[PDB]
Design an enzyme around this catalytic site. Structure first.
Site, PDB file in Angstrom:
ATOM      1  N   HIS A  60       0.813  -1.216   0.000  1.00  0.00           N
ATOM      2  CA  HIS A  60       0.000   0.000   0.000  1.00  0.00           C
ATOM      3  C   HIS A  60       0.834   1.248   0.000  1.00  0.00           C
ATOM      4  CE1 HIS A  60       0.104   2.132   3.913  1.00  0.00           C
ATOM      5  NE2 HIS A  60       0.310   0.953   4.470  1.00  0.00           N
ATOM      6  N   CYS A  61       0.228   2.319  -0.492  1.00  0.00           N
ATOM      7  CA  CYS A  61       0.786   3.674  -0.433  1.00  0.00           C
ATOM      8  C   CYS A  61      -0.245   4.607   0.168  1.00  0.00           C
ATOM      9  CB  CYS A  61       1.128   4.148  -1.826  1.00  0.00           C
ATOM     10  SG  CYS A  61      -0.301   3.884  -2.813  1.00  0.00           S
TER      11      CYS A  61
END
EC number: 2.8.1.1
Length: 103
Positions: A60-61
């Site tokens: 994830h970012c």
């Protein structure tokens, strides 16, 4: 492949790694408690360390843009795992009502 925050939760409960590819300053401000930090630049240099390898890996970012745009890099970095990108990143996780840790 994208994965919803709630579906990601279920995989994490079965041992899947959730890997935050943001920088340390961003992580320290706000992160997902279950995540392991590994900034993308570090992964591109030295690869995924053994401790972060698993049958299932979810990256994830912030808002889904850094995973989307570096899909090919991430697919190699975590190969040969089953790999997912968290839909809309930590922003999506928050919108789903799942817990974050804020400084």
């Amino acid at each position: 492949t994208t994965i919803s925050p709630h579906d990601a939760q279920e995989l994490i409960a079965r041992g899947a790694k959730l890997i935050d590819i943001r920088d340390a300053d961003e992580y320290l401000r706000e992160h997902i408690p279950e995540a392991d930090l590994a900034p993308l630049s570090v992964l591109e240099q030295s690869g995924l360390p053994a401790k972060l390898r698993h049958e299932q890996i979810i990256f994830h970012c912030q808002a889904g843009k850094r995973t989307s745009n570096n899909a090919d890099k991430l697919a190699a970095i975590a190969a040969p795992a089953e790999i997912f990108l968290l839909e809309d990143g930590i922003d999506g996780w928050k919108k789903a009502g799942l817990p974050v840790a804020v400084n």
